[PDB]
Amino acid sequence: AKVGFIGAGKIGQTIAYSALVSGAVDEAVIYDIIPELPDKFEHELRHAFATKGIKANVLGTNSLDDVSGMDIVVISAGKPRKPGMSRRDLFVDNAKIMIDLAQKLPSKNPGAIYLMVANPVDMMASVFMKYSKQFTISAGDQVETMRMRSFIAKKLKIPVTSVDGFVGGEHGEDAVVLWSTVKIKGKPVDEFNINKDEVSDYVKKIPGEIIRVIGGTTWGPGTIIADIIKSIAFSENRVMSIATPKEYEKEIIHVSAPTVVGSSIGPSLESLLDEKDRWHLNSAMKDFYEAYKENLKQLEQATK
Amino acid sequence: AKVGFIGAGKIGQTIAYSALVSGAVDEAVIYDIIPELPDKFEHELRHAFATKGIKANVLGTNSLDDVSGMDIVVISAGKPRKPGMSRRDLFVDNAKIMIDLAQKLPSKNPGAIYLMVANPVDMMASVFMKYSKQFTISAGDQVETMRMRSFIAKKLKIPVTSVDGFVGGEHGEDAVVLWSTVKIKGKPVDEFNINKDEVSDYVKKIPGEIIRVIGGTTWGPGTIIADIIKSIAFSENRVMSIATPKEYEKEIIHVSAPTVVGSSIGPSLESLLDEKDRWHLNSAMKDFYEAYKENLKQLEQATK
Amino acid sequence: AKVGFIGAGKIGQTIAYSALVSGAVDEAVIYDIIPELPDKFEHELRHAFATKGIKANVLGTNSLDDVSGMDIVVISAGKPRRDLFVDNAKIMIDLAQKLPSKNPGAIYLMVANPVDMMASVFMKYSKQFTISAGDQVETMRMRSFIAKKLKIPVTSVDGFVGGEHGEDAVVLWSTVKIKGKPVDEFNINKDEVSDYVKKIPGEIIRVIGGTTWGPGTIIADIIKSIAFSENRVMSIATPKEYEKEIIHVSAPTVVGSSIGPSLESLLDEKDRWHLNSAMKDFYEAYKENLKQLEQATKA
Amino acid sequence: AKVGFIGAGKIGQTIAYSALVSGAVDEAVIYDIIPELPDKFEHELRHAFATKGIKANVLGTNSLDDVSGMDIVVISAGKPRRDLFVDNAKIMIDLAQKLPSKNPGAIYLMVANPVDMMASVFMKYSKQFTISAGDQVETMRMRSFIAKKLKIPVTSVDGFVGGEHGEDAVVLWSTVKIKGKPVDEFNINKDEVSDYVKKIPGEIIRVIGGTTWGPGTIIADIIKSIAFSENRVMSIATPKEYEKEIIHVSAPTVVGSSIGPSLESLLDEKDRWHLNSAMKDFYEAYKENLKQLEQATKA
Ligand SMILES: NC(=O)c1ccc[n+]([C@@H]2O[C@H](COP(=O)([O-])OP(=O)(O)OC[C@H]3O[C@@H](n4cnc5c(N)ncnc54)[C@H](O)[C@@H]3O)[C@@H](O)[C@H]2O)c1
Ligand SMILES: NC(=O)c1ccc[n+]([C@@H]2O[C@H](COP(=O)([O-])OP(=O)(O)OC[C@H]3O[C@@H](n4cnc5c(N)ncnc54)[C@H](O)[C@@H]3O)[C@@H](O)[C@H]2O)c1
Ligand SMILES: NC(=O)c1ccc[n+]([C@@H]2O[C@H](COP(=O)([O-])OP(=O)(O)OC[C@H]3O[C@@H](n4cnc5c(N)ncnc54)[C@H](O)[C@@H]3O)[C@@H](O)[C@H]2O)c1
Ligand SMILES: NC(=O)c1ccc[n+]([C@@H]2O[C@H](COP(=O)([O-])OP(=O)(O)OC[C@H]3O[C@@H](n4cnc5c(N)ncnc54)[C@H](O)[C@@H]3O)[C@@H](O)[C@H]2O)c1
């Protein structure tokens, strides 16, 4: 696929690297406001390509106009999410960038899927789509999903390949494990000794721990988000807990549920979950709506 | 995954090769009735492994008892399907083998998924599960699905990665394209100039053409079926038009629909298709039931 | 790489399959004299491609004229001794007249047997740079055997088989290393190894047969090493000048976007010796085979 | 392979990431002095693994004692001239006392700078077979540059950079080949190439910096070539005897389950020459650096 990267920070680069080396991206244009960053990153990529035999086309640019004719545009531009900053405050910071980008990118990229990575990620997507009018998904809880899976694996001392299931609903600390999806060696999770609350708060707390010690989350989200790009690029039909647009009284919101991801997206599979999880998902919609609507009002004091 | 192969014919070997070289299989036991075939195939595999650095464990055997402790058992043992032989006649040939195998394998392989490849494939699976009592899926119409996709790609002169969708229902000539799933560059299929009947009969006729000229179908089905094994082994959650057991008045039948395939299978996604395709799927169930029930009666003159 | 395949039977299909799913081949043209076989093989490839997201352009053809513009041409066209040389050298001489002017600058890789001898014939008549698969397969057979014998991973065995092809090949024991360590430090019945190499193909052939998966994958890896410019040392048979004629003998050779050098000079003295015996013996047998061909007469 | 990683910063994390998702590393132990960094890095790896189905065992540790039983040890522990040698040679001398008795039979791969010099120090004191990443990165920089300059795929450029590390490295022009053909047949400003190699890291470092993706991937490929026994020729710096001391100079070298031979003997005369200048110059500078270290005094 031809993929455009808006943001060449830590997560931008990890995502780009990982999707380029897997083959999911044959052609990429990489954009940032920082002068000469895209260019130097491109040199890095080209050196990495030599040892692998990768002939993919790559352009690092400081000119937004060079991002045109893309199939997918991955947006990771924005201030990071450190503990002590509320969702509301980050929203106020970062929505500006999305509103700006909504005015420029759609012009140069006709049928492009927009993939949001910048936080607060599902809210960033809802805003970007509100103003861009382009189809926009959020990476959502696919990362959370893989965190849950690896944790259950280490705890039971089994390979991760024996764990199935999804985290969904709202992003980050508001995420919920969809327990009706979770299976261990193919069997209901209730047959095993696992403490659900422990799993749930590992998932919610680990990104904060990682940021505290290292300064940022990269290898995990960047591979996981690159695997989303790959399932689109290769039309793999992987079910992923990304967040897709839904109409709700009657604004557009994004919430995560297991969704079929291929050359086309989706459908989402919320209708196939048990009662408890459909309930948690409904609740997530109500709460997202409330919070997002409020933040939208606040922001709209973009005075005079 | 630890995978057992019952049948080391042309399709057995292609499936085994393809799943071993992808990494989906770390451990395999390969079984056939033909003396020394498994053994010589194992030598071949080991030579192939040297150049790739593959350390997977492989055992070619003529003793059925060596196939134990497997996660997945792939059954491709049986006489092939040549034009001029009815489904009924092949059923009568091949059900015998499945009934035999249903009596031996479950004993040595506790929690194993059984994957049917031998034809008539969905009927072979229904019989194998009837008598083995083990969870059994059929490769179903996943091959048909990939045939449809590549045909639409060549006809429109686009990459296959821009085509999404599934074939389902009954196997082979009775398959139906699920048109509500089919999208080209993400858009409804009705927006493009494609002749649906042409696509449908390419899918139905091409395996016969290939068998006529070459004597058998291998590279296509064997990679496609190896990708099913891979989505189980790596817990990828690829949606695939395999055939899973359903209870119908109230015998167990297998029919294909898009199904989530991971470490756990599924659910199937028939409830999310449009009306026309849900109808075609219901019809497929009625017809399979009728035909399978009749063939079961016939076979049951296993006299005295 | 753009790769043309001459011969779409068992070994040609395997190599073409393996090289396409590894991503080493961007574009292929596949040719056979059997009517509609390449067409149907192309169909099988396209169905396999759909599941992997592979978008390489592939063309099955019954018209040799359609094989043009390639980077590498792989020749596996063959008929089922010495007679064997004559029978198949005619195929090569006919291809030698056709391929070069349609494939400016292409490299040729010989697979059809007798492989070293057929590479030599084809380069004489075509005048194009031609390599033979040589003893790379045997090399991998040797490594596979040692590793199974010592219950270790095949990734802990290093080494090459070289010289002549097939039952005349020699194990180059100064290259063989277990866990990074000289072979003489270990429990290795050399005769048992060398013997497994010579006999295992005949055994596979008898039961199956012949051989597809092993040499298909191994030879596809030569194509990969060329196409990705990996510089893998492999014991292919490259062309060498000897007594005014061009011959093919297998030795460890750097295989990249450029092919060479050979590494015979870096071997120990006994191995350098067996390789000279091999060049001499191959020359004699090649000229004796050329003679019996020159009986190409007009009744 | 079982691979231990000493240093889990920017370059150590990258190499460890790349080697694990390539499947070259079955098992890793990762160590750093920064408290809780390896633990958190291990968490990040596990989340990445879940999406790919990778099941390699990985351990982040703040206890060096936990790095035992490895096949390969990769050292990227470093402090941010000549002073640079002294500062980091202390790290190496301390590791030299600890690692060998816990890692019987392991191979060591030096990444921390000055890389050739640090490999040499560490093998003197540890007495273990030690290689340096050397000029493999530069080699890939050279290929990347030519190919972008001539608008061709990087897979059509072959060649190596060798001798000393970094700004003292030399392009080995007799190895450089475009489309399988001698470099002198093409439009190549050599000074422009050599100059791009020396200056591009400093430029990446200034803007970013420093360098992760490029050398991370390139060095992970050395690990891969060892672990899968691929026999890729790479210009790493292997140990050579010179004036009773052990030194590291980069040359094209076969890298497999066993490491070697070097290929300097197969170069042209000018390149053989620059490599001898390089061994001499590296010796002098290494002994001058050893001297200033031996001022390890007790106030
Ligand atoms: N799982 C996830 O969804 C996930 C994971 C990691 C990071 N993130 C989020 O992604 C964002 C980036 O994280 P990071 O580590 O890369 O931060 P970073 O500070 O490294 O990089 C952000 C980059 O964005 C650029 N930028 C800022 N405004 C821009 C604009 N208008 N146009 C183009 N570029 C612009 C900056 O120049 C910088 O290089 C944050 O919001 C973070 O919380 C999300
Ligand atoms: N898409 C698909 O589902 C697909 C594709 C190709 C082939 N097939 C089917 O798979 C079956 C095999 O096709 P093939 O090309 O490999 O045929 P084949 O004749 O090459 O091989 C079948 C093998 O099964 C073995 N066998 C027979 N009975 C056995 C028993 N009781 N136990 C163990 N082994 C036994 C034989 O010894 C033989 O080696 C056929 O029924 C064919 O129609 C299905
Ligand atoms: N290690 C090796 O190098 C190795 C391994 C296996 C086979 N081989 C050799 O390769 C050859 C092919 O083996 P196979 O197993 O594929 O046998 P095969 O008989 O299945 O294949 C031969 C194919 O070549 C085609 N062919 C014959 N003459 C031709 C011509 N003039 N032009 C185009 N196509 C032509 C035939 O139609 C047939 O499809 C044999 O000579 C075999 O000995 C070499
Ligand atoms: N091509 C190459 O060979 C190449 C490329 C890049 C970097 N490097 C070199 O590698 C080194 C690391 O670079 P970086 O970018 O990762 O820097 P960095 O500062 O991010 O990483 C250094 C890490 O090593 C750890 N460390 C320091 N002393 C240690 C000790 N005694 N034991 C264990 N860990 C220790 C530090 O805590 C830190 O995490 C530098 O010397 C750099 O010059 C070499």
Are C147 and C127 contained in the same domain?
Answer: no
Strand, coil or helix: B82: coil
Question: Tokens 């489904």 map to which residue?
Answer: B87
Q: What beta strand segments (E) does D45-200 contain?
A: 57-61, 72-75, 107-110, 130-132, 157-158, 161-163, 169-171, 177-178, 181-182
Looking at ligand 2, which residue's alpha carbon is closest to its atom 35?
Answer: B77
Distance CA(C198)–CA(C217), nearest Å, equals 19
Amino acid identity, position B282:
N
Residue B117 assigned ligand-binding role: yes
- Whether the upstream peptide bond of residue A120 has omega within 30° of 0, thus cis, is yes
CA distances to A143, A176, A275 from A282, in Å: 21, 12, 11
- The 8-class DSSP code of residue D184 comes to G
Please compute, for residue C73, the number of CA atoms within 13 A of its CA located in the half-sphere on the CB side. 32
CA distances to A104, C15, C40, C119, C235 from C162, in Å: 63, 22, 37, 16, 6
Closest to B47 (Cβ–Cβ): which among C35, C144, C208? C144
Q: Is residue A304 part of a domain?
A: no
Q: Which two tokens stand for residue B269?
A: 């996604």
Select from C113, C115, C223 the residue to mutate for testing ligand 3; criterion: most ligand atoms less than 8 Å from CB: C113
Q: Is residue A208 part of a domain?
A: yes
Q: How far is the CA of D79 from the centre of ligand 4 (A)?
A: 7
**Would you list which residues of chain B are within 8 Å, Cβ to Cβ, of chain D?**
23, 52-53, 233-236
Question: Tokens 């890389």 map to which residue?
Answer: D115
- The 8-class DSSP code of residue A111 comes to T
Q: How far is the CA of C222 from the centre of ligand 3 (A)?
A: 18
CATH code at B72? 3.40.50.720
Q: Is A203 in the pocket of ligand 1 (CB under 6 A)?
A: no
Element (H, E) at A28: strand A27-31
Concatenated DSSP letters of C42-110: HHHHHHHHHHHT---EEEEES-GGG--S-SEEEE-------HHHHHHHHHHHHHHHHHHHHSTT-EEEE
Q: Cβ(B303)–Cβ(A203) under 8 Å?
A: no
Distant-in-sequence, close-in-space partners of A286: CB < 8 Å, separation ≥ 6: none
Looking at ligand 2, which residue's alpha carbon is closest to its atom 22?
Answer: B9
Distant-in-sequence, close-in-space partners of C137: CB < 8 Å, separation ≥ 6: B47, C214, C215, C218, C219
Q: Cβ(A173)–Cβ(A204) under 8 Å?
A: yes
Are A147 and A133 contained in the same domain?
Answer: no
Concatenated DSSP letters of A150-196: HHHHHHHT--GGGEEEEEEESSGGGEEEEEEEEEETTEEGGGS---H
- Closest C-alpha to D128, from C180, C266, C158, C155: C180
Judging contacts by C-beta atoms under 8 Å, the chain A residues touching residue B185 are 111, 263
Judging contacts by C-beta atoms under 8 Å, the chain B residues touching residue C52 are 223, 227
Q: Cβ(D80)–Cβ(A185) under 8 Å?
A: no
Burial of B102 (0-12, 13-18, 19+ CB in 10 A): buried
Strand, coil or helix: A50: helix
Q: Is residue A218 part of a domain?
A: yes
Distance CA(B93)–CA(C268), nearest Å, equals 61
Please give, rounded to a whole number of angstroms, the shortest distance from the CA of B16 to a CA of chain D: 19
Are C30 and C123 contained in the same domain?
Answer: yes
Question: Which residues are C262's β-sheet partners?
Answer: C253
Question: Tokens 């006489």 map to which residue?
Answer: B79
- Closest C-alpha to B64, from B13, B30, B91, B15: B30
Distance CA(B1)–CA(D138), nearest Å, equals 40
Beta strands across the sheet bearing D157-158: D157-158, D177-178, D181-182
Are A118 and A155 contained in the same domain?
Answer: no
Are B163 and B260 contained in the same domain?
Answer: yes
How many Å is the Cα radius of gyration of chain B? 19
Helices H / strands E in chain A, number of each:
8, 14
User: In terms of C-beta distances under 8 Å and separation of at least 24 residues, what long-range contacts does A22-25 make, across chains too?
Assistant: A22/A226, A22/A230, A23/A230, A23/C23, A24/A226, A24/A229, A24/A230, A24/A233, A24/A234, A25/A1, A25/A56, A25/A229, A25/A233
Burial of C206 (0-12, 13-18, 19+ CB in 10 A): exposed
Please compute, for residue A22, the number of CA atoms within 13 A of its CA located in the half-sphere on the CB side. 26
Q: Is residue B300 part of a domain?
A: no
Q: Which two tokens stand for residue B299?
A: 């076979």
A254 is catalytic: no
Amino acid identity, position B98:
M
Q: Is residue B302 part of a domain?
A: no
Looking at ligand 2, which residue's alpha carbon is closest to its atom 33?
Answer: B32
Closest ligand 1 atom, residue A124 Cα? 41
Q: Is B119 in the pocket of ligand 2 (CB under 6 A)?
A: yes
Q: How far is the CA of A7 from the centre of ligand 1 (A)?
A: 6
Distance CA(C180)–CA(C151), nearest Å, equals 16
Are A109 and A181 contained in the same domain?
Answer: no
Which residues in chain C are immediately followed by a break of C to N over 2.5 Å?
Answer: 80
Q: Which two tokens stand for residue B22?
A: 């992808």
| C182 CA to centre of own chain | 28
Which residues in chain D are immediately followed by a break of C to N over 2.5 Å?
Answer: 80
**Would you list which residues of chain C are within 8 Å, Cβ to Cβ, of chain D?**
1, 105, 107, 143, 154-158, 177, 179-181, 227-234, 254, 256-259, 261, 263, 265-266
Closest to C140 (Cβ–Cβ): which among B51, B143, B154? B51
- Closest C-alpha to B55, from D74, D23, C183: D23
Q: Which two tokens stand for residue C44?
A: 């099988």
Q: Which of D43, D47, D165, D248 is catalytic?
A: D165
Looking at ligand 4, which residue's alpha carbon is closest to its atom 30?
Answer: D77
- What count of other Cβ atoms lies within 10 Å of the Cβ of residue C127? 11
Torsion, CA D284, CA D289, CA D290, CA D295, rounded to 10: 140
Residue A282 assigned ligand-binding role: no
Burial of D97 (0-12, 13-18, 19+ CB in 10 A): exposed
Experimentally, the structure was elucidated by X-ray
- What count of other Cβ atoms lies within 10 Å of the Cβ of residue A271? 12
Closest to C23 (Cβ–Cβ): which among A23, A233, A234? A23
Q: Is residue B303 part of a domain?
A: no
Judged by CB atoms closer than 8 Å, whether chains meet at D143 and C105 is answered as no
- The 8-class DSSP code of residue B302 comes to -
Are D160 and D56 contained in the same domain?
Answer: no
Distant-in-sequence, close-in-space partners of A257: CB < 8 Å, separation ≥ 6: A166, A168, A241, A243, A244, A268, A269, A270, A273, A281
**Would you list which residues of chain A are within 8 Å, Cβ to Cβ, of chain C?**
23, 52-53, 233-236
Q: Which two tokens stand for residue B30?
A: 């390969």
Distance CA(D148)–CA(C171), nearest Å, equals 42
Strand, coil or helix: B179: strand
Amino acid identity, position A46:
R
Closest ligand 3 atom, residue C88 Cα? 41
CA distances to B4, C95, C268, D228 from B69, in Å: 9, 52, 48, 28
Q: Is D11 in the pocket of ligand 4 (CB under 6 A)?
A: yes
Owning domain of residue D235: 135-289
Are B150 and B269 contained in the same domain?
Answer: yes
Helix runs in chain B, H state only: 10-21, 37-52, 87-108, 121-132, 142-156, 196-214, 219-233, 275-299
Q: Which of A140, A157, A188 is at the close of a domain?
A: A140
Select from D29, D31, D32 the residue to mutate for testing ligand 4; criterion: most ligand atoms less than 8 Å from CB: D32
Question: Tokens 């509301």 map to which residue?
Answer: A88
Are B103 and B205 contained in the same domain?
Answer: no
Please give, rounded to a whole number of angstroms, the shortest distance from the CA of A90 to a CA of chain D: 24
Distant-in-sequence, close-in-space partners of A102: CB < 8 Å, separation ≥ 6: A127, A128, A130, A131, A132, A134
Distance CA(B209)–CA(C95), nearest Å, equals 29
- The 8-class DSSP code of residue A238 comes to E
Distance CA(C170)–CA(C181), nearest Å, equals 20
Q: Which of A43, A47, A171, A254 is catalytic?
A: A171
Distance CA(D277)–CA(D266), nearest Å, equals 17
Closest to C48 (Cβ–Cβ): which among B17, B159, B224? B224
Q: Is A241 in the pocket of ligand 1 (CB under 6 A)?
A: no
Torsion, CA D284, CA D290, CA D293, CA D294, rounded to 10: -120
Burial of C65 (0-12, 13-18, 19+ CB in 10 A): exposed
- Closest C-alpha to A76, from A146, A138, A23, A22: A138
Closest to B161 (Cβ–Cβ): which among A160, A187, A263? A263
Judging contacts by C-beta atoms under 8 Å, the chain C residues touching residue D232 are 230-233
Distant-in-sequence, close-in-space partners of B300: CB < 8 Å, separation ≥ 6: none
Q: Cβ(D139)–Cβ(D160) under 8 Å?
A: yes
Are D216 and D245 contained in the same domain?
Answer: yes
Across A131-163, b (16+ Cβ under 10 Å) vs e yields ebebebbbbbbbbbbbbbbbbbbeeeeebbbbb
Judged by CB atoms closer than 8 Å, whether chains meet at C155 and D261 is answered as no
Record the resolution, in angstroms: 2.3
Are B120 and B222 contained in the same domain?
Answer: no
How far separated are the first and last CA of chain D, in Å rounded?
45
Q: Is residue D296 part of a domain?
A: no
Q: Cβ(C4)–Cβ(C70) under 8 Å?
A: yes
- The 8-class DSSP code of residue B126 comes to H
Distant-in-sequence, close-in-space partners of C275: CB < 8 Å, separation ≥ 6: C162, C163, C170, C249, C251, C264, C267
Select from A73, A119, A173, A242 the residue to mutate for testing ligand 1; criterion: most ligand atoms less than 8 Å from CB: A119
Q: Is residue C26 part of a domain?
A: yes
Report residue C210: phi and psi, to 5°: -105, -135
Distance CA(B227)–CA(B204), nearest Å, equals 21
Q: Which of A116, A140, A164 is at the close of a domain?
A: A140
Q: How far is the CA of B275 from the centre of ligand 2 (A)?
A: 37
Distance CA(C279)–CA(C277), nearest Å, equals 6
Please give, rounded to a whole number of angstroms, the shortest distance from the CA of B71 to a CA of chain D: 16
- Closest C-alpha to B3, from B221, B232, B267: B232
- Closest C-alpha to A126, from A36, A252, A14: A252
Strand, coil or helix: A117: coil
Report residue A70: phi and psi, to 5°: -100, 150
Distance CA(A253)–CA(D17), nearest Å, equals 35
**Would you list which residues of chain D are within 8 Å, Cβ to Cβ, of chain B?**
23, 52-53, 227-230
Q: Cβ(A252)–Cβ(A124) under 8 Å?
A: no
- Closest C-alpha to D266, from A154, C231, A22: C231
Judged by CB atoms closer than 8 Å, whether chains meet at A219 and D155 is answered as no
Closest ligand 3 atom, residue C110 Cα? 3
Report residue C129: phi and psi, to 5°: -55, 115
- Whether the upstream peptide bond of residue A267 has omega within 30° of 0, thus cis, is yes
Burial of B250 (0-12, 13-18, 19+ CB in 10 A): exposed
Are A210 and A187 contained in the same domain?
Answer: yes
Distant-in-sequence, close-in-space partners of C66: CB < 8 Å, separation ≥ 6: C29, C31, C59
Q: Cβ(B67)–Cβ(B73) under 8 Å?
A: yes
Closest to B154 (Cβ–Cβ): which among C40, C46, C53? C46
Residue B11 assigned ligand-binding role: yes
Distant-in-sequence, close-in-space partners of B259: CB < 8 Å, separation ≥ 6: B239, B240, B241, B242, B244, B265, B266, B267, B268, B269
Question: Which residues are B244's β-sheet partners?
Answer: B255
Number of structural domains chain B divides into? 2
Q: Which of D104, D134, D164 is at the close of a domain?
A: D134
Judged by CB atoms closer than 8 Å, whether chains meet at D230 and C229 is answered as no
Nearest CA in chain A to D136: A51
Q: Cβ(D158)–Cβ(D177) under 8 Å?
A: yes
- Closest C-alpha to C89, from C61, C122, C56, C53: C122
- What count of other Cβ atoms lies within 10 Å of the Cβ of residue B111? 12
Size of interface C-D (CB pairs under 8 A): 82
- Closest C-alpha to A24, from A302, A222, A278: A222
Beta strands across the sheet bearing A238-240: A265-268, A259-261, A238-240, B238-240, B259-261, B265-268
Distance CA(C234)–CA(C221), nearest Å, equals 10
Q: Which two tokens stand for residue D192?
A: 């422009």
Distance CA(B24)–CA(B20), nearest Å, equals 6
Distance CA(A167)–CA(A182), nearest Å, equals 9
Helix runs in chain C, H state only: 10-21, 37-52, 83-102, 115-126, 136-149, 190-208, 213-228, 269-294
Please give, rounded to a whole number of angstroms, the shortest distance from the CA of D33 to a CA of chain C: 31
How many Å is the Cα radius of gyration of chain A? 19
Distance CA(B264)–CA(A186), nearest Å, equals 4
Interior angle at CA B13, CA B11 and CA B15, nearest 5:
65
How many Å is the Cα radius of gyration of chain C? 19
Question: Tokens 């382009």 map to which residue?
Answer: A134
Judging contacts by C-beta atoms under 8 Å, the chain B residues touching residue A272 are 267, 269, 271
- Closest C-alpha to D277, from D137, D132, D136, D162: D162
Q: Is A142 in the pocket of ligand 1 (CB under 6 A)?
A: no
- Closest C-alpha to C57, from C45, C66, C65, C67: C45
Total length of chain C: 299
Judged by CB atoms closer than 8 Å, whether chains meet at D263 and C258 is answered as no
Q: Which two tokens stand for residue C290?
A: 């050329």
